[PDB]
Structure formats: structure tokens, C-alpha cells
């Protein structure tokens, strides 16, 4: 049962060369990675942005299921077909999510879209690995991940230009394109449409055909790649050396599931058990840390801005004003001290304003568009408000007598920060790609992990506004190398019989770790700036420790 097939396949690929076909397939699969990045951003940063100006993580729970299912099915029915199904499900349910009226059905549709998009990546990497020669499985496969960053910047810029506002968890209606939230989904999902359109021009991986048994089809695909590569140059038209290398569906479904479970079991045995356990450790730690910190950074930015505004607030003791009719808008925080006999306030727009220990007699409010303003220890007496935004929600406990309410009325920076963050990892790729074949996958992984560990402490030094963005950029640019190195290692180690299954399972573990990291890190945002600085450091320490215990690239 010696695997001479792998050696012969590599021989054919090396004879063929790296022609135009590799770059064409690179673009086609990069569009799918772009779709993955857009969905990740829209599920981690835009979806929770829907507030009342976090049940948005169930999409991750669907992502993990999709990753496992598509990874298992790909090695049975093919890589191209599973990628097509994944993108199709994601795109169709994104279109359906752009029309629904209500948050619950929206979450359901985005969950079912995350299923497919999470399936995407494992298939993409296992698919492109089989076409590259063993010489450059690091340089090109690393270049392939720039499309995740391009998709991130695409989503961030589109949100920053189309939906610079937020608060639509309770703002919707039967109309269309009337909130600008229903135009973000379509222009985020266009990349998936392009990916599906382009994936029909590429042939299936020859390795899957050779393993399944249809050697002629793999030979045909290799012939196609050779023909295109040689014709690209024009003059050299080198020839190819020809060589050999009803109760009817329930049983079939059970059979396919049993084969997938056999593939999963094979990942854990006298061989591949140690490798897979080490892989799980590294992937969990890395994804945990990265997602947690990428979510904590904009939140800390917001909290620092809030603290600055709180410290930028002043008040002076109020006096008794006869028909003050202060018809100008106020941005001061408090107005402690108030008598205000015969008040005649009209058409004043308070933001961040408070009245404490104030008194109002025969006061009259005409129209106030109050927001974030509340009344504490206010002794209203014979007060009529007519049209106001005052309710029990905006009104703290206080003494009110003979008060009447005749009538009543009914993002821009998180996206910029994330855009800079995702645009700052491009140098990390433009260094990882040109050094991973020269330096080494394992050692580059170790160095990148330890560098991320050291930058973890730096995360806290920059309590200023600018230093936080600087440190986010640094962290991303440092950890991208680890991600690329581990991708190359994972694709190289597992053979074609279990590559996609193993990668999909580790992707599911990474998504579960993303959920746990988001939850834990947002649980203690602004708690001495140490919990996200100690937990991340420990996790990356485990990652670096494990990274030095993996088998070489030959494994």
C-alpha cells in the first residue's frame, strides 16, 4: 500500500511548471477568501453594532458546523463541488437576509450563510495546495491569504461609506433600501457571487480524482494545466508525456456519513493523533487570542473616548430664572441647583445633560429632542411638557406632582479602526510570502508566535488613543505570519485522503475558540487592562510552546 501515487503526482506537477493557470486559480479562490473575510467582519463587528441607540455569535456556532460538514463531505464528493455549494448557500441566504423584516429571522439567515462561508476556507486551501509544486507550497499559498485582508478592508470601507450609523436591531420595516442596512448586505455578498461565477472556469483537483479512482480525469486536468502554462509563453509549446497516473437515499446518506466518520477517526490513530492534538492546541490558542484582541481593541477605544467625554464635563450652580426660555441647545453635563419658577423652555435640543436638585413650578416644555439626558432629584410641580422625548426610561426617580405628558415622540469609527487594522497586516504577508520558502515554516511560526506574545504586553502600554491603533496594527502584522505558516504546515502534513477533513475540524475548533474569546474578552473590557493582557499572553505562550513540537514539513 506504498504511496508511490503521491510521488508520481508530484513528478507530473513539477514537470508541468507554475504557469498562468496557478495565478488564475489564485484570483478565483481569493474571491472566496474575500467572501470569508467579509462575512467574518459583518458577523463580529457590524452585526453586534445593531443596538438600541450579544446574540450575534450563534452565526459562529453555525460556522463551525458548516466547516465540519463541508470539510467531511469534500473528500468524498469533491473539493470544487463542496466549495460551490458553500458559496451558493452563503450567497442565497445573504440575499434572503437583506430582505427579511426583523432581527430573529435575520440571525437565522445569517447563521445559515455562515455555515457555507465557514466551509469555504478549508476547501480553498486544500484545493490550491494540490496544484502547486512542492517547491513553492509556502510562497504562493501565503500570497493566497491577502484576499482575506482585501475582503476585510472591503467590508470595513463599505460600512464606513454606506452605514456610518447604527442601531437597527429595532429599526426595520416592510420597505426596501430605506435604512441603508439593506444595501450593506448585498454589496458585502457580491464577492461571493463573483467567486461562484469564477469557480466554474477551473477544473477539479487531480489528486481527488486519482484517489477516488478516475485516473483519466486527473490526467485530463493535468493536461489542461500543462497546455495553458505552455501556451501562456506562446513560443514553447512543449508536449505532455502521456502516462497512466423508495428507501433508497437513507442508506446512501448513512454510508456517506460513515465514510466521513471513518475519515475523522483516521485523524486519530497510531499516526496523526499526536499531530492532530498539537494542531488543535495551536489553532485554538491562536484564534482565541486574535479574535479576542481584535474585538477588545475597538471596544477599548470607545471606552477611552467615553472616559474622555466624562472628564470633559462641567456644571455651575443654577439660579432661579423667571421664564428662562433658554431657546439654545446645551452640551454641558449637569445643571445642579434649580428653582426655575414659571419656566418657558422651547425648542431646545439637550444631549448629555442632567438636572439634579432642581425645582420646577408652572414650567412649560414645548419641544425637546433630549437624548442621554435624565432628571434626578427634580421636584416638578404643575408642569406641562406638551411634545417631549421624556419617558420613564429617560426620567430617574424623583418627586412629581400634577405633571402631564400630552404628547410624545418616537459605527463611523469602529469601521475605520478595523479598516486600518486589516490594512496593516498586508506588510506581514508581503514579508511572510517572500521568506517562508527561505526561512522555514516551523521556525517562522515559532518566531511569529513569540513576537505576538511580546506584543501582547505592549497592548497595555499604549493607553493613549493613537498608541492603541498602533498596537493593533503591530499585533496583526505580527500574527499574520503565524497564520500563514500554520496553514502551509497543515496542508503539507495531512495527505489528500484526510487533509480537508482535518483542516475543517481544526477550523471548527478555531470558530468555537473565537466565540469563547469574544465572550471572555468583552466580559472584562476595561478591567485594569490586564485580563486581556494576561490571558492572551498565556494562550500565545502555549501556542509558541506547542509550535516547537510539530513534525517537520515532510510529515
Amino acid at each position, epitope marked *: 500500500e506504498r504511496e508511490e501515487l503521491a510521488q508520481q503526482y508530484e513528478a507530473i506537477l513539477r514537470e508541468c511548471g507554475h504557469g498562468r493557470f496557478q495565478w488564475t486559480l489564485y484570483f478565483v479562490l481569493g474571491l472566496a477568501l474575500m467572501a470569508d473575510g467579509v462575512e467574518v467582519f459583518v458577523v463580529g463587528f457590524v452585526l453586534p453594532s445593531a443596538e438600541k441607540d450579544m446574540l450575534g455569535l450563534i452565526v459562529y456556532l453555525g460556522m463551525m458546523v458548516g466547516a465540519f460538514l463541508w470539510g467531511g463531505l469534500a473528500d468524498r464528493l469533491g473539493r470544487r463541488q463542496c466549495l460551490l455549494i458553500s458559496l451558493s448557500v452563503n450567497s442565497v441566504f445573504a440575499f434572503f437576509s437583506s430582505f427579511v423584516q426583523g432581527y430573529g429571522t435575520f440571525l437565522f439567515c445569517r447563521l445559515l450563510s455562515g455555515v457555507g462561508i465557514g466551509g469555504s476556507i478549508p476547501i480553498v486551501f486544500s484545493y490550491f495546495s494540490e496544484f502547486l509544486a512542492q517547491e513553492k507550497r509556502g510562497e504562493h499559498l501565503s500570497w493566497l491569504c491577502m484576499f482575506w485582508m482585501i475582503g476585510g478592508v472591503y467590508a470595513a470601507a463599505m460600512a464606513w461609506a454606506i452605514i456610518p450609523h447604527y442601531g437597527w436591531s429595532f429599526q426595520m420595516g416592510s420597505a426596501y433600501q430605506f435604512h441603508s442596512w439593506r444595501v450593506f448586505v448585498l454589496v458585502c455578498a457580491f464577492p461571493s457571487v463573483f467567486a461562484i461565477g469564477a469557480l466554474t472556469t477551473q477544473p477539479e483537483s487531480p489528486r481527488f480524482f486519482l484517489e477516488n479512482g478516475k485516473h483519466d480525469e486527473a490526467w485530463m486536468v493535468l493536461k489542461q494545466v500543462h497546455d495553458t502554462n505552455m501556451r501562456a509563453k506562446g513560443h514553447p509549446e512543449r508536449v505532455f508525456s502521456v502516462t497512466h497516473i423508495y428507501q433508497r437515499w437513507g442508506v446512501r446518506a448513512l454510508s456517506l456519513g460513515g465514510q466521513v466518520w471513518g475519515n475523522f477517526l483516521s485523524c486519530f490513530g497510531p499516526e496523526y493523533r499526536r499531530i492532530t492534538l498539537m494542531m488543535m492546541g495551536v489553532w485554538f490558542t491562536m484564534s482565541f487570542s486574535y479574535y479576542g484582541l481584535t474585538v477588545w481593541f475597538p471596544d477599548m477605544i470607545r471606552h477611552l473616548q467615553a472616559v474622555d467625554y466624562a472628564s470633559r464635563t462641567k456644571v455651575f450652580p443654577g439660579e432661579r430664572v423667571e421664564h428662562v426660555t433658554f431657546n439654545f441647545t446645551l452640551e454641558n453635563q449637569i445643571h445642579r441647583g434649580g428653582q426655575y419658577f*414659571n419656566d418657558k423652555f422651547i425648542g431646545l435640543r439637550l444631549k448629555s445633560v442632567s438636572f439634579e436638585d432642581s425645582l420646577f*413650578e*408652572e*414650567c*412649560y416644555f*414645548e419641544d425637546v429632542t433630549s437624548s442621554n439626558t435624565f432628571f434626578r432629584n427634580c421636584t416638578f410641580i*404643575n*408642569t*406641562v411638557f*406638551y*411634545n417631549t422625548d421624556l419617558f420613564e426610561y429617560k426620567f430617574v426617580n424623583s418627586r412629581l406632582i400634577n405633571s*402631564t405628558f*400630552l*404628547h*410624545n*415622540k*418616537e459605527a463611523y469609527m469602529v469601521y475605520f479602526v478595523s479598516f486600518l487594522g486589516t490594512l496593516a497586516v498586508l506588510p506581514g504577508n508581503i514579508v511572510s510570502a517572500l521568506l517562508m520558502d527561505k526561512i522555514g515554516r516551523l521556525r517562522m511560526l515559532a518566531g511569529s508566535s513569540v513576537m505576538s506574545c511580546v506584543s501582547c504586553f505592549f497592548l497595555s502600554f499604549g493607553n493613549s488613543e493613537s498608541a492603541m491603533i498602533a498596537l493593533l496594527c503591530l499585533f496583526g502584522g505580527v500574527s499574520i505570519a503565524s497564520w500563514n505558516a500554520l496553514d502551509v504546515l497543515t496542508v503539507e502534513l495531512y495527505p489528500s485522503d484526510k487533509r480537508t477533513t482535518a483542516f475543517g475540524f481544526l477550523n471548527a475548533l478555531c470558530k468555537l475558540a473565537a466565540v469563547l474569546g469574544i465572550s471572555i474578552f468583552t466580559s472584562f473590557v476595561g478591567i485594569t487592562k490586564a485580563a486581556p493582557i494576561l490571558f492572551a499572553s498565556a494562550a500565545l505562550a502555549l501556542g509558541s510552546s506547542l509550535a516547537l513540537k510539530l513534525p517537520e514539513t515532510r510529515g
Partner: nanobody, 119 residues
Framework: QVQLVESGGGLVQPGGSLRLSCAAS????????MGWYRQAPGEQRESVAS???????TYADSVKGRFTISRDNAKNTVALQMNSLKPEDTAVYYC?????????????WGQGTQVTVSS
């Protein structure tokens, strides 16, 4: 005490209209002239609309393209132009006045009039 006047109840078909006119007399000092409310069987009064002061108005979103308010201060009256009277949306309609005099704010309410829909 300002005496308020209520009117305009009875059956109107959807597609038809009614003019419910608020009026008042006595002790009126540049008042916010009576706006409208809908009283249901349940103890509660839903806002409808008001053109009570200046030339500006606030209409409830629930009465968009259904209840229109026009005011004539020179008369101390407010006219509610009822239209789009979908059959289920019946109510007792009330005039709500606000006194803007020297002794401070005071309010007045009428007994209301019942509007039902013909079909």
C-alpha cells in the same frame, strides 16, 4: 376655567370624512389650542395630532395619512379632518387644551365624541 366644546361623532364610511371641530371660550390667553386624543375601551388615551401652536404640527405616526389637523387661532378652534377611516379604528375623540397664562400651565379636557365607521 376655559369652556371647551366637543363635536363630530357618528358613522362615516372608509373613504369618507368627518370634521371634528374643537372650540373654546372664556379665559383664553394665547393658548395652545386643543389637540386630539383617542380613548379605547381600555383605560388609556392615544395621541392623535396637534397644530395647537404656531403653524407647526406633530402627528402621531400611527395616524399617518388618517388624521390631519388644521387650526384657526382667530377663532380659538382646531379642526380634525378624519380620513382613511379603516373600519376597526373606532374611538372616542377628545380635545386637550393647554392654558399658557400668567398663573402658569393648566389643562382642560372635554367629554369626547364617539366616531364609528359605516360600511
Amino acid at each position: 376655567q376655559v369652556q371647551l366644546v366637543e363635536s363630530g361623532g357618528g358613522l362615516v364610511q372608509p373613504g369618507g370624512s368627518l370634521r371634528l371641530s374643537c372650540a373654546a371660550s372664556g379665559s383664553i390667553f394665547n393658548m395652545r389650542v386643543m389637540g386630539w386624543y383617542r380613548q379605547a375601551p381600555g383605560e388609556q388615551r392615544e395621541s392623535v395630532a396637534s397644530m395647537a401652536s404656531g403653524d407647526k404640527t406633530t402627528y402621531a405616526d400611527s395616524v399617518k395619512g388618517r388624521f390631519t389637523i388644521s387650526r384657526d387661532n382667530a377663532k380659538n378652534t382646531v379642526a380634525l379632518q378624519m380620513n382613511s377611516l379603516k373600519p376597526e379604528d373606532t374611538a372616542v375623540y377628545y380635545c386637550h387644551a393647554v392654558d399658557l397664562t400668567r398663573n402658569g400651565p393648566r389643562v382642560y379636557w372635554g367629554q369626547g365624541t364617539q366616531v364609528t365607521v359605516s360600511s
